[PDB]
Point group: C8
């Protein structure tokens, strides 16, 4: 009895160490770049994560001709969740708030990389009601190259996301008349 | 008997080594940046930690247009506490003391990152009565992006904290009429 | 019984660790360089992968005299698939879309490196109907040095792929009258 | 008998190796900076350690407007003592000797970081009668931020120590009329 | 029985790991340098491998006074084959194609390093009929220092290969009247 | 019997490896700096070690305004002796020889760091009769900060040693009227 | 029986791994430098190895005032042979060929480092008939410092080899009237 | 029987590995610097080793005002011999040969570092009759600092050796009237 209980424990602890060493080294990140060619100041940068986190802050504002660079990532240690979230700014020159969403999941058998962006009315913090509205109810974009979309109020965007899981998301927000990039 | 006592000890010492090696490598830090655009000299920098420590000192004073950069961290070795504390300066041009608070907990199942700041009357060192007043009794701010708040005596702040656990806290303290960042 | 069950498990876990450590360290990548000497702007860069991924995005456009550099790779971790895909751009000055295809397989007993390129009518995203048309129905090129081919509408290309599996693909797209490289 | 004596020895030697490997890697240091804005030359630098050591010497003198930087540390190898000591200089322009004291203990369940400084009459080497007079009988300062204190003979200091255990101690010694830092 | 079956398996897996770790770390490469002093443009660079591969492409053309540098190597992983191949260019100013061949074998008990070069009629891709004609039917050169040979049509070459197995092959192709190097 | 003889040998060899690995990694060195502000040339540099060695030589002479830097260390490998020695120079302008002594012991339970210096009559090599005269019969100096001492013939020194065991010894030899450092 | 067959195999495989790991890490190389101060062009550089190889080629020619630097080494992997060889150049201004020989053996119980050089009549590749004539029949030079020797036709050399086994061979070939180095 | 034969073999192979790993990592070297301030050219540099070797050659000549730097070392691998040898140059302006000797032994229980130098009549290679004449019959110098000695023919030397075992030997050879260093 007891000799094989300790030997079966030493085997089981070896398997649990392999499981947690795998889940701690399966990495997800979404290097978000949002470029403001709008002709308008963006301010009051707010953030929500359905899963994952980031180590730096958003810029408080991004002025005309500058970019938000943001580096969100999965929760540290042996946890099987991806990086999924929303980023938002008020745009006081038009009275609307931009929100940008990304999903970079853990389990690519069930899910895939998605992103979206929209303008909401007034000043709003990013929260779960923006995540579900940007991910389900307004048609999101796959990680299959460049897409282009009007925002109303005289703005549009063009953007893309890579399919990697160590993803890049890249968006240019523009006057509607402007040629992308 | 004795062969399985020594083998069960060797297993138990293996488990206690894994527990303490995990608790020694679960890291918490809060890189605090406080920027003084107040028009007023801040002096007599004092500190309290509910948990954690830092290796450098506060500047004795931060003059108009300069910043306090401070790097507090958890207690070293296998201990399951986060970094939580208060930082304070007297502002003799108004007769009040600024205090700034952060919490960056160990256990994100129970807690989350929080911060706050306020002006108290007269000259005071930071201590536990500032920690409970900034964390419970005056409404603190989450790690969900940029927030803005008046201090009275003609000052305000805007600031944010990241949700990481290897956090950044970032505050600009300003004349109340001034545009943030 | 039980002593050899745990010893046969420890052997079997050793073999499964070797299998997954091999499949995680058998690397496939296809460093794609496509050089636009067409005299025409290429735009709306879209991508499909039959297998593998990339971490960066395509440029939204490649102007006259510049190149797309793209670094696709196999799916991360212990999976036995190569990198195979399609890249496409609209060329509005001629009303056609360029598509470029590569295959860099896992199993060189069954497969070999192949590539192709063609112009399709109108504006199209890259998808599986371009992969099968570029890989089966239009004659692809082996990894055996430089090949040259007319595209119609006054364009041609010359290009090559290396046979390595850590491949390079290299294409120059040119006016039909022009000398390659 | 003898098989479990050798196996219980191999376990006990494993535990004693862990104990001494911990005590050899629990580090204490106190990076002392003392800045001489006194208007007076300090000379004949002498040192005492209640526990710990340093590898460099004190400067023989620190002239007006220069600083003593000193890096004391715990005794090397597996020993459970902190760094605790006294540093002293004669100041012949006033006929008194400055002494500075720090404590950076091993066991933060019983102790905490403390420092102090005072002027004694005449010329004296630092020794145990300065350690007990600076640590018990003259009120020492905690590691809780900046403190300020008159020395008599027209001098004062302001200073602070960090609570880390890899501490910094930082003191400016000044004319009594002068603004600190 | 079963205890020595698992112990004999653990031994046999140890031997197969040593065999495959040896065959994966027995390296063969042939750094080919071919220098074009012909007075003639070479173009349409084509390649064949009897064994091994390369990661870069040939230049599409090598103009007068420039060199092809090419770095072929053995197939990656535990396979017991060397690097052996052919490289060819059309030379339209004379209506002939240069081909260059190297062999850098795995098993130096049976084989040795060899190279050759010749001009064929018209425009041809390198293939197995050039490998057998350059390695068997036209007299190849050993790795024993510098050799010199006329090509007809007013060209010659001089060249050498090192015997290492991490070989260099070095050829200068020249007008027949010219002094080598 | 024999199974526990080999197991008790494997334990005993493990203990002797730990003992010799400790004694080989308990380091003693005494970085000696002697600065010649004497106004006199020192020459014929000679050395004695009671224990330890050095890898470089003394300068043959140190002229006015230059320093001897010397880096003596313990005997290499698992030996439990410190670094202890004497350094001497003839000073022909006064007809005397300077000798300098240090001790940096292995066992700080029995011993502590000591140094001394003196002028002897005529020209002498350093040897054991200088070691005992500088360490016992002329009062040596502890590692407790700066000390100052007349030499006769119009010279003095001031100097200090650190208590570390990776020590520094630092001496300035001066005209008797001169202010130290 | 079978338990000690597998344990005696595991011991024997441990011994064969030590033998082959030693023979693979016992290194022999002979960094050959031959400096041409002859007043004459040397050309058609040819090489023979009795044992060992090199990775680079000889220069095709060495002109007046330049040097051949060549780095021959033993055969890679667990083989017990040194580096031994011949290097030769035609010298068309005198109608003779220089040959240079070195031996850098594996087994210094039987052998030692030797070198030689001579001029032969006409144009010849280096081969085994030069190795035996330079090593046995013309008196070779030991690795014991500088030696000097006439070549006839108005040339001489001076040279030396180091005894290391990671040897350097160094020869200056000169007009007979010239002073060496 | 057989189980303890294989276990006693595995112990004995462990001890022989420790012995040879120690003897292969007990290092002896003697960095020889000989500086020629003689006013005379030294030439035809020859060498003998009683034990050890070097990887570089002597300079063929050292002219007036230059130095021989030479780095002899023990025989590589697990052998218990030091570095011991002789270096010699002819000095044709006086018709004599300088020889320099060093000993840097393995076993400092029996031996110590020694050196010597002398002028012999005529031109001679260094050999064993110089080693015994410089080490026994002409009084050698210890590694105890600087020594000075006339050579006859109007020369002298001054020099020293360090006692380390990773020794430096340093000699200046001078006109007899000259002040050393
Ligand atoms: C005695 C035996 C003891 C054995 C005990 C074992 C039980 C412990 C296992 C617990 C499972 C724990 C599995 C954990 C966590 C979830 O948070 C992740 C996160 O998804 P994402 O954000 O990365 O992707 C982005 C997709 N959105 C944009 C969000 C839509 N999966 C999902 O949410 C949906 C998948 C849904 C998949 C969940 C299925 C769980 C059921 C497993 C039981 C079988
Ligand atoms: C013979 C048996 C061998 C025993 C092996 C046990 C190894 C355990 C390792 C424990 C020490 C591992 C390394 C340890 C410790 C110190 O370095 C740091 C100091 O941190 P800081 O100094 O930078 O900042 C100071 C913070 N304040 C200034 C106080 C605010 N720890 C602490 O202070 C308390 C940490 C708390 C650390 C205590 C952790 C308790 C671990 C003991 C569990 C025992 C295992 C089960 C026994 C039954
Ligand atoms: C024979 C068997 C022997 C087994 C022996 C095992 C017992 C040893 C375990 C001892 C538990 C030791 C657990 C230790 C320490 C506390 O200091 C941390 C620190 O929190 P923070 O500063 O990082 O977060 C910041 C939040 N604030 C801003 C402060 C509000 N947790 C809390 O304070 C509240 C959680 C409260 C959670 C405490 C619950 C402890 C009860 C565990 C027993 C079950
Ligand atoms: C308690 C027992 C412990 C179990 C230990 C098992 C360790 C197996 C390690 C498996 C994960 C090892 C590391 C794994 C995974 C992820 O990081 C990458 C993501 O790649 P990418 O994200 O960069 O690009 C994304 C590509 N697309 C965007 C989809 C196009 N894998 C995949 O996506 C699918 C790979 C496919 C990976 C699946 C491989 C299956 C391995 C399971 C075999 C189980 C062993 C036998 C059990 C009986
Ligand atoms: C009780 C015992 C339990 C044992 C369980 C073991 C079963 C698990 C094994 C599962 C096999 C899993 C094998 C997996 C994956 C495929 O995706 C790769 C990908 O190919 P590529 O993109 O890299 O090459 C590029 C070539 N194209 C351009 C695409 C044409 N192979 C193919 O598609 C064709 C080969 C076709 C080869 C597939 C053959 C699978 C059949 C194996 C069973 C025997
Ligand atoms: C055959 C058996 C093998 C035995 C293996 C034991 C290994 C223990 C390792 C002990 C030495 C491990 C390395 C040791 C030591 C020295 O390097 C430093 C010197 O420090 P410093 O010199 O830089 O500054 C000097 C400080 N002052 C100048 C004095 C003020 N230690 C000390 O001085 C006392 C430290 C105190 C160190 C003493 C620690 C005692 C450890 C012994 C415990 C024995 C284990 C149980 C035996 C039953
Ligand atoms: C058969 C079984 C065999 C088992 C043998 C085990 C016995 C060996 C253990 C020996 C304990 C050895 C413990 C050693 C050393 C002391 O030097 C440290 C140094 O303190 P500091 O300078 O770092 O802090 C600075 C504070 N001051 C400024 C100085 C006031 N502690 C103290 O002095 C006070 C704590 C006082 C704490 C001392 C308590 C010792 C009693 C332990 C026995 C239970
Ligand atoms: C139950 C027991 C199970 C045991 C199973 C073991 C059998 C598996 C072993 C299979 C052998 C597998 C051996 C493999 C591969 C060949 O590709 C290499 C490649 O040569 P190269 O290109 O590097 O050199 C360049 C020379 N050329 C320029 C080409 C002329 N050798 C040859 O072609 C000729 C040697 C010819 C040598 C081949 C001889 C093979 C016969 C071995 C059986 C004994
Ligand atoms: C069958 C059982 C077999 C077991 C065999 C074990 C016996 C082998 C142990 C041999 C001990 C070997 C111990 C060795 C060496 C001495 O050289 C060091 C060197 O001192 P220093 O130069 O570093 O300090 C500087 C102080 N001075 C300036 C010189 C005054 N100690 C002393 O000289 C005095 C201490 C004096 C301490 C010496 C005490 C030795 C007695 C130990 C036996 C118990
Ligand atoms: C299932 C069992 C596993 C077996 C594990 C055996 C591992 C042995 C490792 C042997 C290969 C270890 C690595 C080996 C080899 C090649 O890389 C280099 C090539 O050198 P070069 O190419 O740079 O220069 C070429 C020199 N010339 C051009 C010819 C002049 N070796 C040779 O050429 C012959 C070396 C001679 C190398 C042959 C050494 C013989 C070793 C076999 C002994 C077998 C052990 C006992 C078996 C009973
Ligand atoms: C059942 C038991 C099975 C056990 C099987 C063991 C047998 C396998 C061992 C095979 C021995 C294999 C030994 C191998 C190789 C020779 O190539 C080296 C190379 O010399 P060099 O070029 O480096 O030096 C330069 C000197 N020259 C300038 C050339 C004159 N030695 C010699 O030529 C002469 C030494 C001559 C020394 C050769 C003596 C070999 C006889 C050994 C048998 C005892
Ligand atoms: C069945 C049992 C089997 C066991 C087999 C074990 C026997 C193998 C051991 C063989 C010993 C092998 C010992 C080897 C080598 C000698 O070359 C070194 C080199 O000295 P140096 O040049 O570094 O110092 C410089 C001093 N000089 C300037 C030269 C005067 N020692 C001496 O010459 C004198 C010491 C003289 C010391 C030699 C004493 C040897 C006697 C040992 C037998 C007991």
């Amino acid at each position: 009895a007891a000799g094989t209980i300790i030997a079966g424990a030493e085997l089981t602890i070896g398997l649990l160490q392999n499981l947690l060493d795998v889940l701690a080294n399966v990495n997800r990140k979404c290097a978000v770049g949002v470029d403001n060619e709008s002709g308008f100041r963006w301010q009051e940068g707010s953030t929500y994560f359905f899963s994952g986190t980031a180590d730096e802050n958003l810029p408080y504002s991004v002025s005309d001709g500058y970019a938000v660079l943001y580096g969100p990532r999965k929760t540290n240690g042996p946890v099987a969740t991806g990086v999924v979230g929303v980023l938002a700014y008020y745009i006081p020159s038009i009275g609307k708030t931009l929100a940008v969403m990304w999903s970079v999941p853990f389990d690519y058998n069930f899910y895939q990389n998605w992103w979206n962006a929209k303008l909401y009315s007034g000043n709003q913090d990013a929260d779960y009601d923006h995540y579900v509205d940007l991910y389900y109810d307004a048609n999101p974009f796959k990680a299959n190259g460049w897409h282009e979309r009007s925002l109303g109020s005289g703005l549009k965007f063009c953007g893309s996301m890579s399919s990697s899981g160590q993803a890049t998301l890249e968006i240019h927000v523009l006057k509607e008349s402007e040629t992308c990039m």
